[PDB]
Design a binder for this molecule. Structure first.
Ligand SMILES: CCCCCCCCCC
Ligand SMILES: CCCCCCCCCC
Ligand SMILES: CCCCCCCCCC
Ligand SMILES: CCCCCCCCCC
Ligand SMILES: CCCCCCCCCC
Ligand SMILES: CCCCCCCCCC
Ligand SMILES: CCCCCCCCCC
Ligand SMILES: CCCCCCCCCC
Ligand SMILES: CCCCCCCC
Ligand SMILES: CCCCCCCC
Ligand SMILES: CCCCCCCC
Ligand SMILES: CCCCCCCC
Ligand SMILES: CCCCCCCC
Ligand SMILES: CCCCCCCC
Ligand SMILES: CCCCCC
Ligand SMILES: CCCCCC
Ligand SMILES: CCCCCC
Ligand SMILES: CCCCCC
Ligand SMILES: CCCCCC
Ligand SMILES: CCCCCC
Ligand SMILES: CCCCCC
Lengths: 489, 489
């Protein structure tokens, strides 16, 4: 018996629509050397992002709407178009949900549901509160150190986030009664969410085995005659990453403070709650075993490249084990909405960014940069290249496509303007790492920790912009001094 | 606070496991001319189906488990493997959820949720009960006639089912208080579910624009020198389809009777309920408009082949309209479990069948048939070919791959054993149509109407086997007499 329609934010359609429309009417006056379909896809993508901002039809709905409009105005098919030789010359909106990152994140949400159902997350939370609970910044630094230690083993940031630290964040927040999409999110949950994201950034920056784009940078620098190694990257990123570990958390605590700042009796409270939770149970032990097994497969995935260890099949396998074991039914995994919502909208955004890359937008931007800056001292050239490689990730959603597309061209321009090779390589790599401090779709950890409701998106974008300025200053200046020190030039 | 694990049917793992194991140990003694990977994939597929039967880890769980085992023993990657020329020589478990049929069915489940929420389904149900409510077989024949009329326009059976008649079935069942997965399913819901499936079969058989496999048969017969036309197919399938319309419902009513057989006062009851529902509302009017628009796009999709009318993008578009209009939020579409469950398990089954087709199983079966039957009167040859083209669809899940793979070879053998061309073509086409009376994954309508809980799977398979024998008798004998009558030979 439904009487009245649901409440929809129609005002939020103004800025997206308008933006799109204007760019569309601008199409004939496009920057030149560019294709009509490219500019149209750019306009639709920008309007979709402005919608994700103004939040009409929450991100799933507006992403579906942007995909629909993409298919209507003739920028994308529904089924992949083949060249009669098997090659897929055009992808479709259906060939977008077969993405590894989105399915990994969904299965990780499901594993997190299992951790929350068993009672393991809350036990871990009270343990961490007994250890470093008081002075919540202590909790933030502990999660930062945990992520840093895990960076050396787990080569997938999306896993390090949705499998280990996002559950810990959720549990610690639910022990403080910090629920999402509620004015009670500001207690401790939002601070911890943000700090988890930025600790994931730091860990990705410290170890070359912290993410894929770093490996892509390695392959490229080897293409141009510079061999990045686990020890060199580490010895170069140690100092700047320590400076960041010391600063970034402090400015987050000063800018986005944890409303609940002090817990003078965390020890007794955690002990009381644990003892009230009774001894550890069988489903909790099984979930712990499955979690340790998944972590083991993830850390082995760095030495053995094998389909059985794709870092997503591992999540499928853990979920399957939870199903055949009992701690997780199938209905428990079916109405875990976050999984399907993120599947939908992340897949759609990645598809639209891929269409931006294929239609010849990024390549034109790269040629423009290559033909614009001609005579300058290589210092300003490197500054400009870092700034561009930073603020171009607003038009990407993978982090690997960004590098494959813009790392070799910008590095080439730098080395051609007199800059040294190792410095430019490592700087553009650190920049491709800290790019994540731009958006809510920049990577897996952001697409996870921005949509949990603990942190709004306006605040997310603003604070990430500021912290990106800070990251660029830190890495550029400090790491340049550091690389001049240790024989990199 | 979870204490005890969930209840899992461990006994149901015996038959699948055993089966698999045995076939695996049989591998060295495989039929010959076959590949090891092919026989292993066959074993895993068969065990997965036996699991879907015995129901450990409901179909979603056992399909996930079969996919996991597929990836573990080295039969499928997780990411598509390319040949360095762009061609995809091996598909992955992730490149399986980008399927048009599964996403169409999911979006149709969502549209059905909208129809049930608005109050439109119940109004339609009481209308149909006022018209042909008494003598529930009247309801079955009305739904049959509706599906038959829609066959001439909507060229997608999955849509005709999940968009029009599955909602009507659900509403009429919920007006009789027939809920699924309940001993109250036998009242009227199961009979109507079965009858809807078989009416979809009949409509697919009557009009060549009733499904894709019929178009595939058309293309093939044109390849071999026989031009199927909308008027010829219809004039040949009229008589047998009338015989089926008269018989099949009767044997279903005699074999699977609708426990509630008589409703002597349907008129007054429907009028009372309608008047108690008040005049038609605004959300109902909007859902009706969206439904009519989707039906219009679906019927236009037969004359204009355009990505904007893919018969799945239309469901995406209807859902998007319901979102931007208000009658359907995003949370309403996120916890619609059936959509995601069918996505999962149908995609996985289609992927495994595609692996059966690529590894060289179906092609070997076809060569075996081509090299086995050599000297026979073409009548027994056609009998054997119809039987094989019928009972090979247990190893397929699309209905189009089946035809593309086995229609031209069997038709070739028939025409080479003396049989006439038009007769063999039309008979194998009708057989590719009635193949759907085999399984729960044979097509979209079956994968929909078998998993709704109104009809079990054991009963489904048994009754579909019997009705397939009956369909083969009817079509073969009657249609052969009919084609001999009208100048087809
Ligand atoms: C004609 C294209 C106008 C721009 C499309 C706006 C898309 C809205 C997505 C929320
Ligand atoms: C050109 C981008 C304009 C985006 C404006 C977003 C305003 C959001 C107000 C809450
Ligand atoms: C748990 C996945 C381990 C699978 C082992 C695969 C070994 C392949 C050797 C060829
Ligand atoms: C010496 C080249 C590196 C300088 C990078 C400075 C970036 C400034 C960010 C605001
Ligand atoms: C060694 C492979 C045996 C096949 C097992 C298949 C398991 C599927 C269970 C649903
Ligand atoms: C290939 C043999 C399949 C056996 C299936 C038996 C099902 C038993 C259900 C009670
Ligand atoms: C509802 C969308 C109908 C299709 C728009 C017109 C496309 C014409 C492309 C030539
Ligand atoms: C003349 C032969 C026509 C084919 C008859 C098919 C009968 C199938 C019997 C099950
Ligand atoms: C001529 C400069 C225009 C650049 C617009 C494209 C980058 C957003
Ligand atoms: C006012 C609702 C508009 C919906 C977006 C349409 C995009 C062309
Ligand atoms: C380049 C986009 C900027 C993000 C918002 C900045 C608000 C100060
Ligand atoms: C307790 C026996 C279940 C084993 C399941 C393994 C399926 C490959
Ligand atoms: C060699 C005899 C036939 C075996 C058939 C195996 C099942 C397709
Ligand atoms: C060749 C497969 C036949 C299976 C028939 C199943 C009847 C319940
Ligand atoms: C030009 C619009 C800025 C937002 C980028 C996604
Ligand atoms: C959140 C993962 C905790 C596992 C403890 C063994
Ligand atoms: C357990 C993974 C081992 C991989 C050996 C190739
Ligand atoms: C293959 C997983 C075995 C676990 C059964 C309890
Ligand atoms: C009853 C199991 C059927 C096996 C063929 C798929
Ligand atoms: C079930 C669809 C009903 C639409 C009536 C106009
Ligand atoms: C509410 C539907 C509007 C679509 C055309 C702008």
């Amino acid at each position: 018996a439904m009487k009245t329609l649901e409440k929809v934010n129609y005002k939020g359609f103004i800025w997206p629509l308008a933006v799109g429309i204007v760019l569309w009417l601008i199409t004939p006056w496009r920057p030149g050397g560019l294709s009509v379909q490219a500019w149209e896809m750019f306009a639709i993508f920008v309007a979709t992002i402005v919608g994700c901002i103004t939040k009409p039809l929450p991100i799933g709905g507006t992403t579906l709407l942007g995909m629909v409009v993409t298919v209507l105005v003739g920028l994308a098919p529904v089924k992949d178009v083949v060249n009669s030789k098997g090659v897929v010359i055009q992808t479709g909106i259906l060939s977008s949900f077969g993405n590894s990152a989105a399915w990994l994140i969904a299965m990780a949400f499901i594993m997190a549901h299992g951790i929350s159902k068993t009672g393991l997350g809350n036990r871990v939370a009270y343990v961490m509160i007994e250890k470093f609970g008081k002075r919540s910044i202590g909790i933030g630094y502990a999660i930062t150190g945990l992520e840093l230690m895990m960076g050396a083993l787990i080569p997938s940031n999306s896993a390090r986030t949705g499998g280990v630290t996002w559950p810990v964040v959720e549990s610690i927040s639910k022990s403080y009664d910090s629920k999402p999409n509620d004015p009670s999110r500001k207690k401790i949950g939002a601070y911890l969410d943000f700090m988890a994201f930025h600790a994931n950034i730091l860990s990705t920056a410290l170890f070359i085995t912290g993410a894929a784009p770093n490996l892509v940078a390695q392959q490229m620098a080897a293409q141009k005659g510079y061999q990045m190694s686990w020890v060199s990257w580490f010895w170069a990123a140690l100092v700047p990453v320590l400076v960041a570990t010391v600063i970034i958390p402090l400015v987050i605590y000063k800018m986005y403070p944890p409303e609940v700042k002090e817990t003078p009796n965390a020890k007794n409270w955690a002990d009381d709650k644990l003892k009230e939770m009774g001894p550890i149970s069988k489903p909790e032990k099984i979930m712990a075993t499955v979690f340790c097994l998944a972590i083991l497969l993830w850390v082995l995935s760095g030495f053995f490249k094998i389909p059985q260890l794709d870092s997503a099949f591992v999540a499928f396998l853990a979920v399957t084990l939870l199903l055949i074991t009992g701690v997780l039914s199938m209905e428990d995994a079916l109405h875990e909405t976050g999984a399907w919502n993120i599947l939908i909208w992340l897949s759609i955004l990645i598809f639209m960014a891929g269409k931006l890359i294929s239609y010849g937008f990024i390549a034109w931007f790269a040629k423009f940069i290559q033909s614009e800056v001609h005579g300058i001292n290589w210092g300003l050239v490197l500054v400009v290249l870092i700034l561009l490689m930073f603020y171009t990730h607003y038009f990407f959603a993978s982090g690997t496509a960004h590098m494959t597309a813009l790392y070799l061209p910008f590095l080439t321009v730098a080395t051609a303007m007199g800059a040294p090779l190792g410095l430019s390589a490592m700087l553009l790599a650190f920049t491709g790492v800290i790019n994540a401090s731009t958006t809510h779709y920049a990577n897996g950890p952001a697409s996870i920790l921005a949509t949990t409701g603990y942190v709004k998106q306006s605040e997310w974008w603003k604070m990430n912009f500021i912290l990106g300025l800070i990251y660029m200053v830190i890495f550029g200046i400090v790491g340049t001094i550091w690389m001049k020190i240790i024989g990199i030039w």
